[PDB]
Design an enzyme around this catalytic site. Structure first.
Site, PDB file in Angstrom:
ATOM      1  CB  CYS A 169       4.338  -6.719  -3.997  1.00 35.28           C
ATOM      2  SG  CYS A 169       5.952  -6.327  -3.872  1.00 35.28           S
ATOM      3  CG  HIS A 309       3.309 -10.780  -7.992  1.00 36.24           C
ATOM      4  ND1 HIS A 309       2.576  -9.632  -7.471  1.00 36.24           N
ATOM      5  CD2 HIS A 309       4.645 -10.628  -7.760  1.00 36.24           C
ATOM      6  CE1 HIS A 309       3.433  -9.082  -6.608  1.00 36.24           C
ATOM      7  NE2 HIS A 309       4.556  -9.212  -6.844  1.00 36.24           N
ATOM      8  CD  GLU A 320       3.098 -14.732 -11.089  1.00 37.74           C
ATOM      9  OE1 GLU A 320       1.861 -14.741 -10.832  1.00 37.74           O
ATOM     10  OE2 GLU A 320       3.539 -13.754 -11.399  1.00 37.74           O
ATOM     11  CE  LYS A 338       2.682  -6.397  -9.862  1.00 44.12           C
ATOM     12  NZ  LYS A 338       1.434  -7.001  -9.621  1.00 44.12           N
ATOM     13  CG  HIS A 343       5.048  -3.206  -8.300  1.00 45.99           C
ATOM     14  ND1 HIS A 343       3.933  -3.702  -7.284  1.00 45.99           N
ATOM     15  CD2 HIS A 343       5.950  -4.172  -7.948  1.00 45.99           C
ATOM     16  CE1 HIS A 343       4.245  -4.309  -6.555  1.00 45.99           C
ATOM     17  NE2 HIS A 343       5.327  -5.025  -6.661  1.00 45.99           N
ATOM     18  CG  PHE A 402       9.889  -6.938  -2.430  1.00 48.96           C
ATOM     19  CD1 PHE A 402      10.615  -7.366  -3.341  1.00 48.96           C
ATOM     20  CD2 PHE A 402       8.916  -5.767  -2.874  1.00 48.96           C
ATOM     21  CE1 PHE A 402      11.002  -7.053  -4.612  1.00 48.96           C
ATOM     22  CE2 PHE A 402       9.171  -5.212  -4.260  1.00 48.96           C
ATOM     23  CZ  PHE A 402      10.253  -6.059  -4.911  1.00 48.96           C
TER      24      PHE A 402
HETATM   25  C1  LIG Z   1       3.735   3.472  -6.952  1.00 44.55           C
HETATM   26  C2  LIG Z   1       4.906   4.427  -6.093  1.00 44.55           C
HETATM   27  C3  LIG Z   1       5.117   3.655  -4.939  1.00 44.55           C
HETATM   28  C4  LIG Z   1       5.885   4.539  -3.880  1.00 44.55           C
HETATM   29  S1  LIG Z   1       6.300   3.738  -2.429  1.00 44.55           S
HETATM   30  O1  LIG Z   1       6.346   2.441  -2.484  1.00 44.55           O
HETATM   31  O2  LIG Z   1       7.612   4.239  -2.037  1.00 44.55           O
HETATM   32  N1  LIG Z   1       5.097   4.189  -1.316  1.00 44.55           N
HETATM   33  C5  LIG Z   1       4.952   5.494  -0.721  1.00 44.55           C
HETATM   34  C6  LIG Z   1       4.414   5.620   0.452  1.00 44.55           C
HETATM   35  C7  LIG Z   1       4.112   6.688   0.987  1.00 44.55           C
HETATM   36  C8  LIG Z   1       4.705   7.878   0.475  1.00 44.55           C
HETATM   37  C9  LIG Z   1       4.361   9.275   1.015  1.00 44.55           C
HETATM   38  N2  LIG Z   1       5.251   9.892   0.042  1.00 44.55           N
HETATM   39  N3  LIG Z   1       5.665   9.035  -0.823  1.00 44.55           N
HETATM   40  C10 LIG Z   1       6.621   9.561  -1.945  1.00 44.55           C
HETATM   41  C11 LIG Z   1       5.396   7.816  -0.605  1.00 44.55           C
HETATM   42  C12 LIG Z   1       5.601   6.683  -1.011  1.00 44.55           C
HETATM   43 NA    NA Z   2      -2.241 -10.609 -10.170  1.00 45.71          NA
END
Ligand SMILES: CCCCS(=O)(=O)Nc1ccc2cnn(C)c2c1
Ligand code: NA
Ligand SMILES: CCCCS(=O)(=O)Nc1ccc2cnn(C)c2c1
Ligand SMILES: CCCCS(=O)(=O)Nc1ccc2cnn(C)c2c1
Ligand SMILES: CCCCS(=O)(=O)Nc1ccc2cnn(C)c2c1
Ligand code: NA
Lengths: 414, 414
Positions: A169, A309, A320, A338, A343, A402
């Site tokens: 994050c 955050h 926080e 957020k 997020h 995290f």
């Molecule tokens: C706001 C949503 C964030 C989802 S995540 O943290 O799991 N990052 C994420 C990064 C790359 C890819 C490629 N496909 N996908 C599905 C992805 C997902």
């Molecule tokens: Na912030």
């Protein structure tokens, strides 16, 4: 002991910003929507929700999908985060007036939470179906997590370093922190920095849901993200990517660029407490805020605004609140974006840094959505109801990721 | 203008090193083996070679597999690079005398090329077979690429920042660069830093083989990695992970730690040239070497030794020869350890940084293996045949990673 205030560090200004969010592909429209109390969070329409019967059925997809701007070639040559990076990079440069800068004094720093991970599975599948020679010669450059930053550096011609910090994050804020360091240490005069992140899909939802980290208030999606509210029940995914242009004040003045704000200092600490939970006492996270003030040359009484955050998990918002108190900033007006934008993991610190810049530029803080019954054990001055116009001179943006990674960025009104 | 030489930066020393390689799990045994002309590169015995009929059938697995040290619990709770990080972290701390340091002045910076990627596929498979609730609540913390650094920071109690730079082949050197910055900017007094990387498997081989980046000299595995040789034909995978302990000279002296070398400066630049090929002219890579000298306070004539990036690709070695000449360092004695240890991507810059420290400590450079018919278009002073004992006062370690990321680290004899 050098500080921005005493001239030990060069003055660094923010001269352009760009972002794509669940509210809008245009950052100024996102800002207007936030001020109007809009939420990007909706009921998820995707087939995968019903296919898996996910406990979480809400989230904020980008208002304007990245790939509606991508032709066949880009869909072949780049991972998703690379396509988002290419799109935002070109938008930012146009917004900056397409300046001609010295490539040898121009750095790129773009964080991300994971990388080109969908290309790992695709390459796996192609090789399972057709052998090793059905893996693309482009597989390595699409998969590698440094790929989005490399794409942007190649697009814009940055030869003073192309860096990718990964800290969940806090990745997008940490990127801005390292870009600031690259300038104040003398390695660069101008830097594109921020964060990109992938989209909402079923496996990301399952993975974070199994920590109980996500809200399941599916019947009222815009009401689900409730940072610092007594009835919060976890975070909501909201897709985003964001970049800003920073440069020395002297570099900006020499090319006629009008600063939107000053980037004054950056603090990076760590909890060494738990692999995903933040430390309850907030001490090291507060120390990141304090360190950003030390480098800026500010005292806590100078801090008018904290862009929290504020993920709306029970333990995260409580930690926080302790951090802000530890840093002596608990009289500041607090915003938790957020609440409205969700997020976006590796992008969100960069997005919120842009929002902090806009708060300082326009002297206004958007309302924290869904802040209706303040948690009795948290006593912060949370902006809510409608935007608060005020005399915001300095602000800190918090990102506590995290893994225990704490990044605080200190900004000033220009 | 601050430099290490003029006291503008605090003096920073290397006080402990650890590494696991294809030659040995013990860095001093690896060093002895390198000096004896040993190679870690062998014919790959794994079933996956015959299963896919891979063009590449050679490589160097770790002499001592990480998981021979991992019980059921660690195999459940951590990705591979996290297990390697935990193993090396504990070994390094023991080697340092298990010092009690101030956690608030103690940073961890560990690079890696990819992250916990095998856990992405596993979580994918578990969810396909059993639904979203068969994804582990530990999936996020195992997958996230910051995971290895977080594990080490949690293990050792580092609360002055836990950072993960990703820059492919330069990740492990870039980590040492950022740890040095964290100390000289005043954020930390002591840092564990380096790089970890995953093992050789069929998909990694297919992915890099399809760029024609890898040697296919399968009949003579120990002869295949030929940096700067006329008959080189690409790099060879050689597994590794490596960490070092750095701290201010004052911090080391206060606890009775004996420095192995000094870390004097670090340069980070970028090519902005191509997503995987280095720039032929070597200019920005040479500029990373020059920048490390500027920060150290050295001139090129001071540089007695270059630990080359030297992957043994045709274009990469030619570009690096131009970079060394651009930096004015072409009278330095050159070593290319990938000739013996292979390429470990995100770990290799950290491994080679450890080797540079040992070269300075012991006044000896191991032979570059397989340097038999020097490429007529490259004219460097490559150490070969047997180790060269010499008066090495200062040295630069080069790492030039896919994506155009150039990191040079300047070290000095203590
Ligand atoms: C706001 C949503 C964030 C989802 S995540 O943290 O799991 N990052 C994420 C990064 C790359 C890819 C490629 N496909 N996908 C599905 C992805 C997902
Ligand atoms: Na912030
Ligand atoms: C396309 C595969 C998605 C992998 S996932 O569903 O497990 N989500 C995920 C997991 C960990 C991290 C750390 N940073 N980030 C962004 C993450 C995202
Ligand atoms: C010296 C070999 C380097 C191979 S690699 O560059 O593809 N890194 C790598 C990283 C993580 C994992 C998990 N499983 N596997 C197979 C991995 C591989
Ligand atoms: C377990 C899946 C392995 C993914 S892979 O076979 O395509 N190798 C791979 C690809 C890209 C990069 C960048 N850094 N690093 C280390 C990499 C490694
Ligand atoms: Na090297």
């Amino acid at each position: 002991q050098p500080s921005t205030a005493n001239g030990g560090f060069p003055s660094v200004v923010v001269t352009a910003v760009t972002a794509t969010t669940s509210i809008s592909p245009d950052i100024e429209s996102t800002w207007k929507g936030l001020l109007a109390g809009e939420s990007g969070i909706h009921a998820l329409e995707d087939e995968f929700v019903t296919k898996w019967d996910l406990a979480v059925k809400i989230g904020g997809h980008l208002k304007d999908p990245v790939d509606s701007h991508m032709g066949r070639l880009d869909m072949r040559r780049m991972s998703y985060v690379q396509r988002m990076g290419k799109l935002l990079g070109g938008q930012l440069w146009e917004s900056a007036g397409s300046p001609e800068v010295d490539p040898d004094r121009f750095a790129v720093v773009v964080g991300t939470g994971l990388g080109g991970a969908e290309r790992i599975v695709e390459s796996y599948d192609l090789m399972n179906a057709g052998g090793p020679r059905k893996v693309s010669p482009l597989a390595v450059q699409m998969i590698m997590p440094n790929g989005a930053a490399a794409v942007i550096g190649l697009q814009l011609g940055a030869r003073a370093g192309v860096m990718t910090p990964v800290s969940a994050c806090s990745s997008g804020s940490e990127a801005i922190a390292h870009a600031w360091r690259q300038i104040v240490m003398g390695d660069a005069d101008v830097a594109v920095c921020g964060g990109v992140e992938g989209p909402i899909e079923a496996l990301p939802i399952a993975a974070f849901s199994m920590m109980r980290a996500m809200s399941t208030r599916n019947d009222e999606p815009e009401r689900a993200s409730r940072p610092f509210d007594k009835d919060r029940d976890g975070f909501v995914f909201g897709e985003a990517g964001a970049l800003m242009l920073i440069e020395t004040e002297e570099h900006a003045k020499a090319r006629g660029a009008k600063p939107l704000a000053r980037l004054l200092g950056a603090g990076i600490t760590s909890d060494a407490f738990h692999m995903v939970a933040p430390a309850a006492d907030g001490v090291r996270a507060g120390r990141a805020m304090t360190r950003s003030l030390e480098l800026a040359g500010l005292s806590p009484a100078d801090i008018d605004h904290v862009n929290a955050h504020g993920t709306a998990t029970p333990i995260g918002d409580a930690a926080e609140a302790n951090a802000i108190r530890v840093a002596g900033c608990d009289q500041a007006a607090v915003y938790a974006p957020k609440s409205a934008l969700g997020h976006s993991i590796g992008a969100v610190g960069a997005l919120e840094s842009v929002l902090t810049v806009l708060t300082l530029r326009d002297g206004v803080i958007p309302p924290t959505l869904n802040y209706e019954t303040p948690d009795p054990e948290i006593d912060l001055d949370v902006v809510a109801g409608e935007p608060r116009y005020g005399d915001y001179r300095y602000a800190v943006n918090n990102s506590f990721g995290f893994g225990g990674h704490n990044v605080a960025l200190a900004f000033g009104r220009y």
